[PDB]
Design a protein around this ligand. Sequence first.
Ligand SMILES: Cc1cc2nc3c(=O)[nH]c(=O)nc-3n(C[C@H](O)[C@H](O)[C@H](O)COP(=O)(O)OP(=O)(O)OC[C@H]3O[C@@H](n4cnc5c(N)ncnc54)[C@H](O)[C@@H]3O)c2cc1C
Ligand SMILES: Cc1cc2nc3c(=O)[nH]c(=O)nc-3n(C[C@H](O)[C@H](O)[C@H](O)COP(=O)(O)OP(=O)(O)OC[C@H]3O[C@@H](n4cnc5c(N)ncnc54)[C@H](O)[C@@H]3O)c2cc1C
Ligand SMILES: O=c1oc2ccccc2cc1O
Ligand SMILES: O=c1oc2ccccc2cc1O
Lengths: 340, 340
Amino acid sequence: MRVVVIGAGVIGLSTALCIHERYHSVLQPLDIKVYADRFTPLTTTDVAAGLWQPYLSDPNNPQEADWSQQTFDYLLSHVHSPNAENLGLFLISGYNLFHEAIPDPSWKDTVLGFRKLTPRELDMFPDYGYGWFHTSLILEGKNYLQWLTERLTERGVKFFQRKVESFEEVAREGADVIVNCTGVWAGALQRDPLLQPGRGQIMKVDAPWMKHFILTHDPERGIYNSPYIIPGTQTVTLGGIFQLGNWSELNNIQDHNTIWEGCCRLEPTLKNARIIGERTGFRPVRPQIRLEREQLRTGPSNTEVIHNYGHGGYGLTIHWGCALEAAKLFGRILEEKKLS
Amino acid sequence: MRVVVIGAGVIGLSTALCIHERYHSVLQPLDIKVYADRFTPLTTTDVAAGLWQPYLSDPNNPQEADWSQQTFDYLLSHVHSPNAENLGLFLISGYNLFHEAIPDPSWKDTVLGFRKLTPRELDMFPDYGYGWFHTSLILEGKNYLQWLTERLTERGVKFFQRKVESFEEVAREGADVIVNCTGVWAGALQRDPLLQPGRGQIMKVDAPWMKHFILTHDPERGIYNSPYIIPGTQTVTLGGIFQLGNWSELNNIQDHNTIWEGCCRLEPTLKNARIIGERTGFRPVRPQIRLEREQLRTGPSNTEVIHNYGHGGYGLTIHWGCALEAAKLFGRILEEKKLS
Ligand SMILES: Cc1cc2nc3c(=O)[nH]c(=O)nc-3n(C[C@H](O)[C@H](O)[C@H](O)COP(=O)(O)OP(=O)(O)OC[C@H]3O[C@@H](n4cnc5c(N)ncnc54)[C@H](O)[C@@H]3O)c2cc1C
Ligand SMILES: Cc1cc2nc3c(=O)[nH]c(=O)nc-3n(C[C@H](O)[C@H](O)[C@H](O)COP(=O)(O)OP(=O)(O)OC[C@H]3O[C@@H](n4cnc5c(N)ncnc54)[C@H](O)[C@@H]3O)c2cc1C
Ligand SMILES: O=c1oc2ccccc2cc1O
Ligand SMILES: O=c1oc2ccccc2cc1O
C-alpha cells in the first residue's frame, strides 16, 4: 500500500495530510512519501499573499464553488484557536473596486459582512465608482507549508528532494498510487495543453499601517492585471501583474513600475513605504482544476494516478475542498480493486 | 500680543497650531510659547491607542458631537495624503460587542460603512450577542505629537520645559492670553471638583496578524472597564482598565491579569503574542470638556485664560473641533478688547 505524492506546495501537502487523516487507520501499513523538486520557502505557494478569494465568475465546474466554501468553513473554524498563527491564518477586511455595477459574487454569503460600498467610501479611491466591502481570511503560504510539514513529520510522512522525469520512473520504484500535485509544471510529466503559466510579479513592502486589502477590477486588462494591495503579518504585498504563457522567472522593471505607479495611486501613503523584496510566480492556470483518476496501464503494472493541479490564482482559497475530494478518489481506488 | 499655551499633549499642541494658522497674519507680532512639564514621548497622549470613537451616549454638551465629527472629517480628508503616516493616521475597521441590543450611536453616519453584526460574525466572540462593525481611523499620539511639534517649530513656536505653579506666575512673565491645556493636572492650577483621573493600564503586544480593533461593552462594569484590542502601526494595544479617582502612575499585576485573561478570551491567538511594554495613563475625566474664557482680574493686569481640558477617553477623537473652538474664543478676546 505505497503512496507517492509529487509536489510540496499547498496542493501536495494538503492532499498528503487529507489521505493520511482519512486512511491511516483503515489501512495499517499506509506508506506515504512526498517527492518534490522545490520545498516550503521556494514554491509558488510561498509567493501567494493567501487571501481567500475565488474568481468573480461562476466556476466552469460547479463543484469548485463548493470546494472554496469548504476551505473557508474549515479555515474560519480554526481562525480563533491559539494555533491559528502557526498556520499563518487571520481575518482581514477590505475592498473590491470596480469601474461599473457588476453582479454580486457567488461567494457573497460565504464571506463575513459582505455589502456594497457607500459613496463616502468610493470617494477615497478616485478612479472607481462601484465596489464591495467584506471580511475574508489570509492563510500565508509560507507558514501554512511549515505547518503541514510538521503535521506530516509527526504522522511519519517521509519527504524526498528530487525532480521526477515521468510517472513510470515513480511506478518502477513500487508506488501503487501516484498523487500528481505538480502545479504549473504538470505538463512536463504529461502534456496538458489547457495548463499554462499565469505569470505574476509582486513587491513585499514595509507598510504596517495598512490594515485592509484593496483589489481593483478591470474587464479591459483582465484578471490580476489591475492593482492590488494585500497586507500580511509581517509585510504588505503589492501586485497587479498577470501574463498568460510567460515563463520568465525573473523580475522586470516594466512590471515593477506598473505595480508601484498603480498601487501608489490607489494608496498614496505607499510612496514612503520601504521595499523589502520582489518576487515572480507562475499561477497554474487551467479552465478548471484537473482532479480525477487515470490508469497508468501505459506504464508498469496497473498503477493509478490522482491528478490534482491547475488551481490558477485560487490555490489557497480552494485547497481544502480539493484535498478532501482527492482523499475521496483515493478511497474509490481501494474499493474498486476489491480491497474492502 | 504674547500667548502662552500650558501643555504639550494633543490639546495644547493642536490649539497652538490652530491659533497660529488663524491669527499669524491677522496679528503681525504674534508670539506663541508652549510651556509643558512633560513633552511628546511621556504625555497621556502617548499612552492612547488613538482610535476615533466618541462615547456611545449623546454628549452632555451637544457641541461635543459636532467637535468629534469635525475632527473625523479633518482626519479622513488627510488619510490618503503621502504624509498621513508622519501624523500616525490610518483607516481601520472593527467590532463593538454588546451583551444586548442597545441603540445605534449618534456618530453612525460619521464613520464609514457602519452596520449591525450578523449571526456568523457574533459566533466568533462567544460571550457577546449584539454588535456593530464599521471603519474608523487611528491617529497615533506619539507620531501626531511629533508632527504638531515640527509644524510649530517651522512656524516659530518656542517650546519651554517647566512646571507652572499658578496662572499668576505666567501672567507676571508678560503673557496677555493663557491657554490652559493641562489635562488631568488642571486642578493643581485652579481647583476643579469635576475633573478626575480615569486610570487606565494597557499592554503593547507584538501581534501583527491582528487587523481589526475589538471593543467590548458592559453597562455593569462601565466604560473602558471591559476588554479591548486596538492594533497600531507597530504593535497591538491591549486594554480594559478604568479606575476613576486612582492616581497610581504604576502598573499592577491585578490589572495586568485582568487585561490578559479578558483579551485572550476575546482573541485566543494572543496567548502566543510577545509583551513589548505596559503603561499607565490618566484620562482627564470631566462630565463635559471645559472650553471657555475666564478673566484673571484676580491676578496681574486684565489677563484672559482659555480653558481647554477634560477630554476623558476621547481627546484624540475630539481635539480638532476643540482647537478650532479655542481659536474662535481667542478671536473674541481680540474683538472685545476694541483691538479690531
Ligand atoms: C503572484 C501570485 C499571487 C497569488 N495569490 C494568491 C492568493 O492570494 N490566494 C490564493 O488562494 N491563491 C493565490 N495564488 C495561487 C497559489 O499560489 C497557487 O494556486 C497554489 O500555490 C499552487 O499550488 P500547487 O501546490 O499547485 O503548486 P506549487 O506551489 O507550485 O507547488 C508545485 C510543487 O510541485 C513541484 N513539482 C513540480 N513538478 C515536479 C516534478 N517533476 N518532481 C517533483 N516535484 C515537482 C514543485 O517543486 C512544487 O513543490 C497566487 C499566485 C501567484 C503567482
Ligand atoms: C489608557 C488610555 C487610552 C486612551 N485611548 C484613547 C483613544 O483610543 N482615543 C482617544 O480619542 N483618546 C484616548 N485616550 C484619551 C487621550 O489620551 C486624552 O483625552 C488626551 O491625550 C488628553 O490630552 P491633553 O492634551 O488633555 O493631556 P496630556 O496628554 O496629558 O497633556 C497635558 C499636558 O499638560 C501638561 N501639564 C499639566 N500640568 C502642567 C503644568 N502645571 N505646567 C506645565 N505643564 C503641565 C503635561 O505636562 C502635559 O504636557 C486614552 C487615555 C488613556 C489613559
Ligand atoms: O495576484 C493575485 O492576487 C490575488 C488576490 C486575492 C485572491 C487571489 C489572488 C490571486 C492572484 O493570482
Ligand atoms: O481605554 C480606552 O480605549 C478606547 C478605545 C477607543 C476609543 C477611545 C478609547 C478611550 C479609552 O480611554
